[PDB]
Write an enzyme that holds these catalytic residues in place. Sequence first.
Site, PDB file in Angstrom:
ATOM      1  N   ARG A 209       1.862   5.978  -8.788  1.00  0.00           N
ATOM      2  CA  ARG A 209       2.305   4.916  -7.874  1.00  0.00           C
ATOM      3  C   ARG A 209       1.537   3.630  -8.180  1.00  0.00           C
ATOM      4  NH1 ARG A 209       2.945   4.749  -1.677  1.00  0.00           N
ATOM      5  NH2 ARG A 209       3.756   2.792  -2.592  1.00  0.00           N
ATOM      6  N   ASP A 234      -1.403   8.636  -0.627  1.00  0.00           N
ATOM      7  CA  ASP A 234      -2.508   7.695  -0.747  1.00  0.00           C
ATOM      8  C   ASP A 234      -3.822   8.441  -0.531  1.00  0.00           C
ATOM      9  OD1 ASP A 234      -0.356   5.724  -0.530  1.00  0.00           O
ATOM     10  OD2 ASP A 234      -0.690   5.609   1.619  1.00  0.00           O
ATOM     11  N   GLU A 505       0.087  -7.159   1.638  1.00  0.00           N
ATOM     12  CA  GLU A 505      -0.025  -7.181   0.190  1.00  0.00           C
ATOM     13  C   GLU A 505       0.583  -8.488  -0.320  1.00  0.00           C
ATOM     14  OE1 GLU A 505       0.265  -2.313  -0.432  1.00  0.00           O
ATOM     15  OE2 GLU A 505       2.081  -3.585  -0.051  1.00  0.00           O
ATOM     16  N   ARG A 521       3.698  -9.270   2.056  1.00  0.00           N
ATOM     17  CA  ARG A 521       4.296  -8.278   2.923  1.00  0.00           C
ATOM     18  C   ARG A 521       3.836  -8.510   4.349  1.00  0.00           C
ATOM     19  NH1 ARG A 521       3.078  -1.848   1.902  1.00  0.00           N
ATOM     20  NH2 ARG A 521       3.682  -1.045   3.968  1.00  0.00           N
ATOM     21  N   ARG A 583      13.135   1.605   1.451  1.00  0.00           N
ATOM     22  CA  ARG A 583      12.676   1.012   0.185  1.00  0.00           C
ATOM     23  C   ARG A 583      13.732   1.291  -0.855  1.00  0.00           C
ATOM     24  NH1 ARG A 583       6.112   2.184   0.430  1.00  0.00           N
ATOM     25  NH2 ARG A 583       5.663   0.437   1.854  1.00  0.00           N
ATOM     26  N   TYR A 617       7.350  -0.269  -4.706  1.00  0.00           N
ATOM     27  CA  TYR A 617       6.382  -1.192  -5.316  1.00  0.00           C
ATOM     28  C   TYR A 617       6.837  -1.553  -6.734  1.00  0.00           C
ATOM     29  CZ  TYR A 617       2.835  -0.566  -1.628  1.00  0.00           C
ATOM     30  OH  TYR A 617       2.115  -0.504  -0.442  1.00  0.00           O
TER      31      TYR A 617
HETATM   32  C1  LIG Z   1      -5.450   1.560   0.189  1.00  0.00           C
HETATM   33  C2  LIG Z   1      -4.127   2.140   0.552  1.00  0.00           C
HETATM   34  O1  LIG Z   1      -4.027   3.130   1.255  1.00  0.00           O
HETATM   35  N1  LIG Z   1      -3.071   1.513   0.049  1.00  0.00           N
HETATM   36  C3  LIG Z   1      -1.724   1.983   0.329  1.00  0.00           C
HETATM   37  C4  LIG Z   1      -1.043   1.368   1.575  1.00  0.00           C
HETATM   38  O2  LIG Z   1       0.243   0.840   1.260  1.00  0.00           O
HETATM   39  C5  LIG Z   1       0.991   1.999   0.879  1.00  0.00           C
HETATM   40  C6  LIG Z   1       2.478   1.846   1.077  1.00  0.00           C
HETATM   41  O3  LIG Z   1       3.256   2.471   0.350  1.00  0.00           O
HETATM   42  O4  LIG Z   1       2.855   1.117   2.037  1.00  0.00           O
HETATM   43  C7  LIG Z   1       0.552   2.381  -0.549  1.00  0.00           C
HETATM   44  C8  LIG Z   1      -0.820   1.819  -0.887  1.00  0.00           C
HETATM   45  O5  LIG Z   1      -1.360   2.501  -2.022  1.00  0.00           O
HETATM   46  O6  LIG Z   1       0.577   3.032   1.772  1.00  0.00           O
HETATM   47  C9  LIG Z   1      -0.552   2.483   2.496  1.00  0.00           C
HETATM   48  C10 LIG Z   1      -0.157   2.032   3.919  1.00  0.00           C
HETATM   49  O7  LIG Z   1       0.788   0.949   3.970  1.00  0.00           O
HETATM   50  C11 LIG Z   1      -1.387   1.623   4.725  1.00  0.00           C
HETATM   51  O8  LIG Z   1      -1.850   0.323   4.361  1.00  0.00           O
END
Ligand SMILES: CC(=O)N[C@H]1[C@H]2O[C@@](C(=O)O)(C[C@@H]1O)O[C@@H]2[C@H](O)CO
Length: 661
Positions: A209, A234, A505, A521, A583, A617
């Site tokens: 990912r 994650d 993000e 985001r 998504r 992503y």
């Molecule tokens: C540090 C971390 O956990 N990063 C995550 C965050 O974003 C994602 C996502 O797919 O949205 C994937 C990233 O790798 O899942 C998490 C969630 O949103 C909480 O922030």
Amino acid sequence: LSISPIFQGGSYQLNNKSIDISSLLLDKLSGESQTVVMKFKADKPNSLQALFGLSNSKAGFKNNYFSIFMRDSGEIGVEIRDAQKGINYLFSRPASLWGKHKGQAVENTLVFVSDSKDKTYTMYVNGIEVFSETVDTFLPISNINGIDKATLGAVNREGKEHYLAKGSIDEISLFNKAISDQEVSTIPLSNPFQLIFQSGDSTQANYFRIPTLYTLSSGRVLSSIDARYGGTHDSKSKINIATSYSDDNGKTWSEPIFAMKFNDYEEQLVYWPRDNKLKNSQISGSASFIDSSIVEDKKSGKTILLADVMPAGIGNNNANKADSGFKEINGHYYLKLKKNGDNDFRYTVRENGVVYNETTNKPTNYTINDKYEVLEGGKSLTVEQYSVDFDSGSLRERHNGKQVPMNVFYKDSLFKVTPTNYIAMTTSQNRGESWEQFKLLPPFLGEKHNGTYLCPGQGLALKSSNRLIFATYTSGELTYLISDDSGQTWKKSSASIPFKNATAEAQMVELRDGVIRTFFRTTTGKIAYMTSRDSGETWSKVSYIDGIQQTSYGTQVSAIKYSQLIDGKEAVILSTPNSRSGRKGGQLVVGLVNKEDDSIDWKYHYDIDLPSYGYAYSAITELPNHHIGVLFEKYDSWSRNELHLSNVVQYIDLEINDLTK
Ligand SMILES: CC(=O)N[C@H]1[C@H]2O[C@@](C(=O)O)(C[C@@H]1O)O[C@@H]2[C@H](O)CO
């Protein structure tokens, strides 16, 4: 292939009307093993449609059939059903198909192997194994009681066409043999994509990912990614950061290496369970890295990669928000350590790695080396590595007999860091052929605040200066990290945002010298932006992009400043899902910059694939030849139905004329 087809046909149009091939196929089926090879297009599929059926079409036998079916989500599957035998097999995997690419329907190559010897049903699409299922009681696809129809584009049940298809089958072949995985690999493909990272490569991660891409000054294109071992979860998990590069404008890629890795847990290629009872299984005692970002520094020539660092068993959900893991003394921040048996953090890591006792004010005989490993009187201490397995019917994490260097981020270490999140930095002086040992960045928001979270993708190298900027986020703000000395030192620039608890993000483009626009985001269903007109020192209030929809939880968005004029204007390209549902519905959106007020006309939207097909992503970069490379998660990485899919982070090459058609 070692054997000729028992049936071969082609150019079948599926226009919501089945094609009966009974007389051509049924009496040619024999023996208990079969292979189906099908090349097919479906750029406007129905919600649920059968591509191929073998059925008992008679009254009272509606559930006696074999089918190959797909969903408009991109899922592919089979059913193998016989009511007299009490068998109702359904095997499938989401996000297995392509629909269109460059506005044209994609020819998907499907290979289904039904192997009576190994009692296993295996499906490949576009060269990727999407499921392989072994059963206790094998059901040969021909042995369904009373089969009397072979059908394209429907299943004939009680004389009626069910699961009618829209699409085409350009070729279909059947064999009375289970062809080998080796024979399967010889079948020609017509794929619109490439893989940079993939299952079975040097990382030995079965999942990936969080892609990134960056074009270096030499013309080399570099990519980083999360190599995710414990399914697609994650952190907390086992995750390393891997990199690969291309020297031919993305046509081929190097075998991956690691930019950041931990060795407390083995690098295991594991098939993570997808069933509802076990899919949430998560590696809970491993240290990890997560969310990487790349930039190149002109002055030094260094390539710089940052990522979050998580101690054993830690992720964003359980990191201590009220502790940075450093003690300030005074003006300088020193990493805190807790020794086994102490309830408090009595130690700090001072100059030269010396472990210092804060309660006695004396140095100890322990030192921490540049790899964050523990030494005692100069000698390396070790810990026993863990491995993971599901052999007992649940996730087990257990010592495996191998000693590895004792690292302060590990569960088994004598000295342990604060259970919070950090950011680390590595550099390469050979453009990604090797990476230096990582160094933690200091805390930016004080002693009693956890790390900010790195925004995955690219940092920004300002064109006219030596300034480097990496966006990060935390509750209530973007925290830009700024270096004017090739990443040796960093300062923050905080930009308040009107959301708390956002995964904000953010990715940046330099519209013109010293003017930066950041796209990010939000929790609002719209992508936000803000602007700095002083090279990141200060930032505007937040505005929102019209004409793109995201879900309430949002998705990362990648963004670049294109080097060439489009319609006589400066151009920015955004990459994001465009959907309020999930998504899905990936697009590149081309924005033309107004030279008078820096506003952007989002003039072109290019669909990466169908609105209903997954897109999460993403990474985009202008390749040296002015093409656009996109490396992206081709699945819904939020969905609890699409966890733990392999080989869904994919690469494509596009030209500007593909986007603006
Ligand atoms: C540090 C971390 O956990 N990063 C995550 C965050 O974003 C994602 C996502 O797919 O949205 C994937 C990233 O790798 O899942 C998490 C969630 O949103 C909480 O922030």
